[PDB]
Amino acid sequence: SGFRKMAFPSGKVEGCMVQVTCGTTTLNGLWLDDVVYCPRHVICTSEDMLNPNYEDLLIRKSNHNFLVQAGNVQLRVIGHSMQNCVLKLKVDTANPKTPKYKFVRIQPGQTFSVLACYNGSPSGVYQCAMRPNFTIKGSFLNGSCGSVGFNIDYDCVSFCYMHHMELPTGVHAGTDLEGNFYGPFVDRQTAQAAGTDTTITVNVLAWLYAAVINGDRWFLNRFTTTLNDFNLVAMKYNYEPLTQDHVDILGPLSAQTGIAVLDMCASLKELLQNGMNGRTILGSALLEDEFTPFDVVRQCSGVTF
Amino acid sequence: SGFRKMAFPSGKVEGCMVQVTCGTTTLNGLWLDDVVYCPRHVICTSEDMLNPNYEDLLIRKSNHNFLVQAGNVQLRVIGHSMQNCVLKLKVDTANPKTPKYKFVRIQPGQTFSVLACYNGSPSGVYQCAMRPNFTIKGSFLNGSCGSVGFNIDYDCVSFCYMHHMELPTGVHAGTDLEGNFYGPFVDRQTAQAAGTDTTITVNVLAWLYAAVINGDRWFLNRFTTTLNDFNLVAMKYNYEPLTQDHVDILGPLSAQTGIAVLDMCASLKELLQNGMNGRTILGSALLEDEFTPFDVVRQCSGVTF
Numbered sequence: 001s002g003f004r005k006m007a008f009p010s011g012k013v014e015g016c017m018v019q020v021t022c023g024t025t026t027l028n029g030l031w032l033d034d035v036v037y038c039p040r041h042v043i044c045t046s047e048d049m050l051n052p053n054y055e056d057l058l059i060r061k062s063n064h065n066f067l068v069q070a071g072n073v074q075l076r077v078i079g080h081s082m083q084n085c086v087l088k089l090k091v092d093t094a095n096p097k098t099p100k101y102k103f104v105r106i107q108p109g110q111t112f113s114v115l116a117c118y119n120g121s122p123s124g125v126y127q128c129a130m131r132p133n134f135t136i137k138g139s140f141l142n143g144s145c146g147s148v149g150f151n152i153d154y155d156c157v158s159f160c161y162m163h164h165m166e167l168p169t170g171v172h173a174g175t176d177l178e179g180n181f182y183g184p185f186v187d188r189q190t191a192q193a194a195g196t197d198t199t200i201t202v203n204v205l206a207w208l209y210a211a212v213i214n215g216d217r218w219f220l221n222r223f224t225t226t227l228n229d230f231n232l233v234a235m236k237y238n239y240e241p242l243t244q245d246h247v248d249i250l251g252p253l254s255a256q257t258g259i260a261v262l263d264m265c266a267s268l269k270e271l272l273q274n275g276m277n278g279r280t281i282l283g284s285a286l287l288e289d290e291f292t293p294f295d296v297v298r299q300c301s302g303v304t305f
Numbered sequence: 306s307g308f309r310k311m312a313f314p315s316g317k318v319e320g321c322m323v324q325v326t327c328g329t330t331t332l333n334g335l336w337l338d339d340v341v342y343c344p345r346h347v348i349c350t351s352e353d354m355l356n357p358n359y360e361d362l363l364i365r366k367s368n369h370n371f372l373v374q375a376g377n378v379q380l381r382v383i384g385h386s387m388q389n390c391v392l393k394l395k396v397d398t399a400n401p402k403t404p405k406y407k408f409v410r411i412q413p414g415q416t417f418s419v420l421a422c423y424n425g426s427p428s429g430v431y432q433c434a435m436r437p438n439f440t441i442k443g444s445f446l447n448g449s450c451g452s453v454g455f456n457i458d459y460d461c462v463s464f465c466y467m468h469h470m471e472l473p474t475g476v477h478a479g480t481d482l483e484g485n486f487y488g489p490f491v492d493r494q495t496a497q498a499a500g501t502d503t504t505i506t507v508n509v510l511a512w513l514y515a516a517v518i519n520g521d522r523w524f525l526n527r528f529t530t531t532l533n534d535f536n537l538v539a540m541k542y543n544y545e546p547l548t549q550d551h552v553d554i555l556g557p558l559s560a561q562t563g564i565a566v567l568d569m570c571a572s573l574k575e576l577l578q579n580g581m582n583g584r585t586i587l588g589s590a591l592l593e594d595e596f597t598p599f600d601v602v603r604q605c606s607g608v609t610f
């Protein structure tokens with residue numbers, strides 16, 4: 001029993017973290033096979049910070065301007081290329097610790113683990129969700145860019161996030177491993193505000209199922225509702241709309257707890273309309289929305305990797 | 306910026322997790338050098354649970370009854386011994402991945418990272434505190450016994466916890482790596498009282514400093530207090546008494562933020578007496594006590610390993 005915010009074991013990603021230094025700027029890169037991936041703003045100077053011409057800065061750089069360090073092993077860069085907002089440094093050595101991996105682009109609401117890193121070295125691991133407004137509420141200091149987010153399915157690491165920047169509000173913005181920003185953000189020091197984030201409804205419901213599984217059941221009521229009536233309530237409380245897909249996704253938890261999804265929707269509706277009355281659910285006084293249905297199952301079922 | 310419950314990178318521990326099988330029951334072991342550490346109750350069976358005679362049960366076993374698997378590779382057990390509540394299987398082979406390590410017995414209120422494992426395979430990593438009553442509020446299912454908790458200091462893994470059991474109460478009990486239980490618990494299937502818990506005051510204050518460092522400052526008050534006055538309040542709200550030692554441990558945070566320790570206590574006193582009025586501190590509606598002052602500094606300074 002018990003329910004905690006659990007990250008994937010980070011070993012397979014730790015062996016891929018390197019340090020990338022171009023001129024005065026050092027950040028983290030991802031070493032897979034003979035390629036190092038890192039944010040393109042490594043080639044920026046403090047001058048270009050407000051609006052850099054990335055094509056200009058790049059074409060002028062050559063292979064030896066990039067210092068890549070895997071632990072104490074210096075890698076020799078034998079090629080470089082820019083793909084969207086990431087740099088791909090070709091190195092002379094394939095990473096002997098390269099795991100089975102894929103690059104994926106996650107949807108809002110999906111969770112992943114972040115291995116926060118500085119100067120190529122791992123600092124700690126925690127779980128994040130891609131917020132509906134395409135930011136993440138992470139823990140990133142200066143030099144953390146290039147840290148990555150990932151999921152692990154048995155032996156295969158699915159890289160989904162590379163960290164690039166903090167917004168003025170303290171939230172975090174980044175790309176997939178093809179360099180495409182999540183959300184409308186760009187890699188310059190400009191005026192870019194996240195936008196109103198909403199609550200991931202299907203996740204709150206999964207966590208409510210998790211609560212029931214662990215014996216917290218006070219919030220359960222004698223009411224049901226409809227998807228339409230519930231969506232009216234979710235919209236008033238800045239909750240993502242619930243779809244038939246979300247309902248289908250919640251089947252497994254519904255069949256384990258014997259609690260119909262619409263019945264749990266009626267519970268969540270009462271919790272949104274009346275608040276929590278100073279009670280706690282799974283040790284929290286807020287409705288928690290950073291567990292997917294897969295997370296709840298995996299944590300209540302023991303899936304390993 | 307930002308602040309999350311952050312675990313140490315788990316890689317060094319991942320290469321140490323093996324599967325130990327003795328007859329019917331299989332659990333997780335810790336393979337360091339040529340020794341595999343696991344809960345001695347792996348030698349129990351169905352009828353032995355309520356009050357096993359471990360000395361007697363161990364006698365009925367010899368080396369070949371203990372199946373150790375490190376991945377698909379089989380380890381040959383060549384010696385076996387009981388140390389308090391842990392079995393020590395001496396094996397044919399030193400773990401080539403053995404990190405630099407120590408065994409330590411931590412103090413209540415200290416934190417560590419847990420690498421939750423099933424069948425010798427890691428499934429996730431999370432941070433938690435040794436409660437004042439020597440339990441931990443973890444996430445552990447059947448077969449998770451043998452999973453370990455640890456801290457890392459640069460390159461040395463300090464193993465401090467091995468998981469043994471869930472109390473019917475839902476919290477978790479285990480031992481140091483010499484097999485001595487934290488708290489009054491015994492490794493038998495019997496009802497066992499954990500005893501009154503307390504909130505870890507110094508950690509709450511450390512987390513309030515973390516909050517200030519991250520821009521949540523609404524709770525900072527126009528008031529002060531005294532150690533004895535604060536402790537009268539702390540004891541009413543089931544908080545650990547604050548000592549000068551705790552004050553001194555808070556010195557660096559107080560120095561960084563410019564807020565005297567006894568002033569932050571005045572802030573904490575009023576949160577305790579009045580609640581949060583539906584405000585959140587670092588995304589929480591409860592006062593968090595699972596961050597040590599060192600945890601905060603490490604996270605807000607980007608310490609690396």
Ligand SMILES: *CC(=O)N(c1ccc(C(C)(C)C)cc1)[C@@H](C(=O)NC(C)(C)C)c1cccnc1
Binds near residue numbers: 044165167
């Ligand atoms: C990479 C990094 O850590 N940055 C960062 C530097 C430079 C940029 C641009 C503007 C694209 C050149 C973006 C990010 C840190 C930083 O220096 N500044 C801001 C606040 C992100 C603009 C940083 C600090 C904290 C968290 N993430 C990133």
Ligand SMILES: *CC(=O)N(c1ccc(C(C)(C)C)cc1)[C@@H](C(=O)NC(C)(C)C)c1cccnc1
Binds near residue numbers: 001332445492494
């Ligand atoms: C090892 C394990 O996962 N146990 C467990 C088995 C056997 C024992 C004793 C009674 C000491 C032989 C202790 C723990 C799980 C379990 O089956 N039962 C209890 C309730 C913990 C006693 C278990 C399940 C969940 C979390 N931890 C352990």
